[PDB]
Design a protein around this ligand. Sequence first.
Ligand code: NA
Lengths: 125, 125
Amino acid sequence: GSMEAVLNELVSVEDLLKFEKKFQSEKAAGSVSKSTQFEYAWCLVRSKYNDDIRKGIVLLEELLPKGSKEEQRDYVFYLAVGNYRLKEYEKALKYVRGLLQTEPQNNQAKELERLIDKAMKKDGL
Amino acid sequence: GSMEAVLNELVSVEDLLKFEKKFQSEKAAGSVSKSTQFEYAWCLVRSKYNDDIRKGIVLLEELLPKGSKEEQRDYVFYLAVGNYRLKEYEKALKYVRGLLQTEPQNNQAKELERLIDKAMKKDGL
Ligand code: NA
């Protein structure tokens, strides 16, 4: 599908609250999983609200050294998304260019790079 | 990420209205694209509302003979999602098993098949 649609997607209230409650439950139990932390962070970085996106970025950065290679690909993609949403354009490009270093022919990553750069330059940065 | 999360995702009000307005604009112009029709159908089949999901399924079935191979993969996946959401379990399984015929090692499709079958049997069907 469309990278622009995925990059600009806003999570629903219902899904954000569903995975927030799931994360809170595991944290209460003292047994947080990479899977649930990622599901919650995936919702947070797609929120309309700055404080949510910032929290989602922290949760993804926590996951990064714990992920297998196939997991880290997902974390880095949504770290690019989340930083883009905060106008952390430099960091967003750093994350996507890391992905491209490992996957130079990944044109989905290339399109994400274009969409971040377009926004950054539109903002005068 | 998680197939269960993707299968049960509810689209946000903002995205559904964004792509609905985009589709309406192209229809008004007389120039509907596969891309925009798919974006709108992708939101519709993730709606909470039956009439939306049904309309999204029609729009995807319209796209099926117009899609390249890589496009049809996306259409069939979200035809499985949409039919699952309507408790059209037979049709949902038909769509995912079509995907598996062409991609037998696609374990994401396999997990989608399990999640549809689990729901179908839980419903006594
Ligand atoms: Na919403």
